[PDB]
Design a protein around this ligand. Structure first.
Ligand code: V1F
Ligand code: ZN
Length: 257
């Protein structure tokens, strides 16, 4: 029932998910001036050489690219993390226009979209148990701006016509997520939450400072997806982002400068 409209969007979520008004909600505005450089933070370690993609899925509010996480393949560690987090899936949030789309903002600046690479803490054994823990997930957020195409995203864009509507899926093997990363791994990090229902407060957010560039034609294809299922009135999948939430009693830390 929740979604992104006037009647079921982010401002309504608290009625079914009271944690929406909780103490460590995401996304947030990253105030670059008050983010403290933390010389104790490590370089982030992103090991995606063995990643195995399985499927791509329109789940009715984004598209997910899913990975086989049953072995220790694609892992995120280092950075602020005390453990080993395993890649499970990635997805995006984007706008109806280039001027909006991202969930995190940087000195109130909105990017055209934001990629989330979602990983779960291997000390909890699986994703479903990890989300019940305050250090259960690590989500790597990467901003998208519109400019030159990202060659490494084109395979994703090209398959979207095949999962236009909610609940459609498609085989999606041998996709290499290393092709979606920017050159620098400088990052901001803070404790936060899933940004859609159930809004669980289980996420260490690591947001890269350097955005990737995608082309206007690439992001236009994201906007041709549908929130509705096949045979229902067409509602374009756009603006599936939650606005910035109160920082409350949290410090955003920077890995750089
Ligand atoms: N935007 S996000 O990165 O914080 C996020 C959520 F907000 C979130 F609620 C979830 S969820 O699985 O608990 C609910 C549904 C969902 C699915 C895909 C994108 C956004 C929300 C995931 N988890 C992603 C996920 C999906 C399937 C299997 C494992 C992880 C998730 F990654
Ligand atoms: Zn997300």
């Amino acid at each position: 029932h929740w979604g992104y409209g006037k009647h079921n969007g982010p401002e309504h979520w608290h009625k079914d998910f009271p944690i929406a008004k909780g103490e460590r909600q995401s996304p947030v505005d990253i105030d670059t001036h008050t983010a403290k450089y933390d010389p104790s933070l490590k370089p982030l370690s992103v090991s995606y050489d063995q990643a195995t993609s399985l499927r791509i899925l329109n789940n009715g509010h984004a598209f997910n690219v899913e990975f086989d996480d049953s072995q220790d393949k694609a892992v995120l560690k280092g950075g602020p993390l005390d453990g080993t987090y395993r890649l499970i899936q990635f997805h995006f949030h984007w706008g109806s226009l280039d001027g909006q789309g991202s969930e995190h903002t940087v000195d109130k600046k909105k990017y055209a979209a934001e990629l989330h690479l979602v990983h779960w803490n291997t000390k909890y054994g699986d994703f479903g148990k990890a989300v019940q823990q305050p250090d259960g997930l690590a989500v790597l957020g990467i901003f998208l701006k519109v400019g030159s195409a990202k060659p490494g995203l084109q395979k994703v864009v090209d398959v979207l016509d095949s999962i236009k509507t909610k609940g459609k899926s498609a085989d999606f093997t041998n996709f290499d997520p290393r092709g979606l990363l920017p050159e620098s791994l400088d990052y901001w990090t803070y404790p936060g939450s899933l940004t859609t229902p159930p809004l669980l407060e289980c996420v260490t957010w690591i947001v890269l400072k350097e955005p990737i560039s995608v082309s206007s034609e690439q992001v236009l294809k994201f906007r041709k997806l549908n929130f509705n299922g096949e045979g229902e009135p067409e509602e374009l999948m756009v603006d599936n982002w939650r606005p910035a939430q109160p920082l409350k009693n949290r410090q955003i830390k920077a890995s750089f400068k």
